[PDB]
Design a protein around this ligand. Sequence first.
Ligand SMILES: Cc1cc2nc3c(=O)[nH]c(=O)nc-3n(C[C@H](O)[C@H](O)[C@H](O)COP(=O)(O)OP(=O)(O)OC[C@H]3O[C@@H](n4cnc5c(N)ncnc54)[C@H](O)[C@@H]3O)c2cc1C
Ligand SMILES: NC(=O)C1=CN([C@@H]2O[C@H](COP(=O)(O)OP(=O)(O)OC[C@H]3O[C@@H](n4cnc5c(N)ncnc54)[C@H](OP(=O)(O)O)[C@@H]3O)[C@@H](O)[C@H]2O)C=CC1
Lengths: 255, 93, 143
Amino acid sequence: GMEALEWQGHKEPCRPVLVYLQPGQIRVVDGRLTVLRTIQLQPVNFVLSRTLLLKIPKEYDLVLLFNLEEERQALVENLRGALKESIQEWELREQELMRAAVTREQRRHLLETFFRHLFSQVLDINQADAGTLSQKVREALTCELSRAEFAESLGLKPQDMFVESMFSLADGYLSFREFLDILVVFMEEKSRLMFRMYDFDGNGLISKDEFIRMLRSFIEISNNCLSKAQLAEVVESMFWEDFHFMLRLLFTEAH
Amino acid sequence: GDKLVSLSRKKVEISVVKAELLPSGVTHLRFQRPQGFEYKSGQWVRIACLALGTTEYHPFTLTSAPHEDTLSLHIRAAGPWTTRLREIYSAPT
Amino acid sequence: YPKLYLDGPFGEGHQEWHKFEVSVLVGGGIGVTPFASILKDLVFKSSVSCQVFCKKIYFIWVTRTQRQFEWLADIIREVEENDHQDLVSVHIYITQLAEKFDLRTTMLYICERHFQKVLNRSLFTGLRSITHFGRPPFEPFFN
Ligand SMILES: Cc1cc2nc3c(=O)[nH]c(=O)nc-3n(C[C@H](O)[C@H](O)[C@H](O)COP(=O)(O)OP(=O)(O)OC[C@H]3O[C@@H](n4cnc5c(N)ncnc54)[C@H](O)[C@@H]3O)c2cc1C
Ligand SMILES: NC(=O)C1=CN([C@@H]2O[C@H](COP(=O)(O)OP(=O)(O)OC[C@H]3O[C@@H](n4cnc5c(N)ncnc54)[C@H](OP(=O)(O)O)[C@@H]3O)[C@@H](O)[C@H]2O)C=CC1
């Protein structure tokens, strides 16, 4: 292992940490012998710029800082050897790398506007609220989170009744996709909301697999045992419009 | 400034419940507590008696406990104001 | 944990709401941190004492977002949980525009008006008190 710096977004200060490169898992730890992350590789991509951003497949992107550019090359060589022992590399601008890979501030800023776009029909807010300018939105929804991280994202403690109940309904981790999939089904208009939720491109057509994914999610709404076979049979017999196919005194009032 | 501050304070108007002519020339005045009257032990108030037609405020230590529903003062007949209060409260009605 | 150096209270704690049978406590932004204490104190009084002058207390919390103040939600939860005399009625007013909602605000809004309750407690927060979105209607409230 070696001592280096880790970035935490535009608004957060860098943290001096240490890197240990085991084959099965790469561990970033604090200076007090406290492990901060242990990423295990399943047989991911890397970008170099002083800065090395490894983009985890379904986890948070990890950006590390090097003492020198030659030190960056040496650390990159060591990490690449350790990772390949148990493989795509690119190079982009420093600002481009910072604003391209998923950061905490960027992820929150994307998820908030995505949720507003989803629930505009309920909030009675015009769809021109903000701009969600697709693939990165899918990646953000795909990222599964631990209980503490998810509760922090929602401003709750890890042991609150709401988060624990929704984790029980969702079950070790949770992605926002499953979260709002449970939420909307537990919330006829639900079909339209779910369809528009799976319409990332906004063209209005869930091409091949999003339809089966929506069927599986609506099954996750209704607890059952023969779920997969029943959903497959329903899809076979049946085949937005897919929604139609699926269906086939005190005064406190704020301005 | 001191007179303006004295004007700023709102002088409550209250009524007496009981008056005792205690020996050695003492007056025990037990009177009604205003609704939001909160005080600690050893605190003192000011009183005026318009039956004298004088509008004088004199200080007296609250001899009743804060847990009591009324307020008690043990006024010693020390001079004109106190003696006049004693004699005016001597008679009923 | 480290040790602290404490300099005692400087508050000079006016409590004129005990002088009124009905009081309306309005908290805004950062000026609502004390009220937690206040609220708890009030309910504790209503638990131990019987002939209290303040028969009903209204707590109008007004905030843009509950960010950095989520703990006050749990404080209000316990306050209303222990309020066995219905002394305090809480009203939360989120004044943030719907176009600028964060995750917590969207979840609270939907659990308030687009997700069914459980025991008249919102699934997100858990409060019998109703959250409203917009400027609090102060003078219709007074009437
Ligand atoms: C904090 C405090 C608490 C008191 N508590 C009591 C009590 O519980 N019982 C009690 O009998 N007496 C108390 N006194 C004494 C108080 O001064 C009486 O009101 C006073 O004896 C009234 O006198 P008089 O005006 O009738 O006669 P005066 O002849 O006018 O008074 C003679 C004496 O009274 C004093 N005095 C008069 N007016 C005032 C005033 N406005 N402020 C201060 N001193 C004054 C003078 O210094 C003088 O020595 C207290 C005084 C103070 C300062
Ligand atoms: N007792 C006191 O003297 C206090 C003073 N302050 C002062 O207020 C300043 C800002 O407070 P801050 O913590 O940012 O509070 P915030 O502005 O974050 O929140 C206050 C809430 O009140 C609403 N609000 C704010 N200003 C007005 C206004 N002029 N008219 C109507 N509604 C309003 C806001 O709604 P929206 O923004 O959506 O309109 C917001 O929801 C601080 O500098 C602080 O010094 C704060 C607390 C107590």
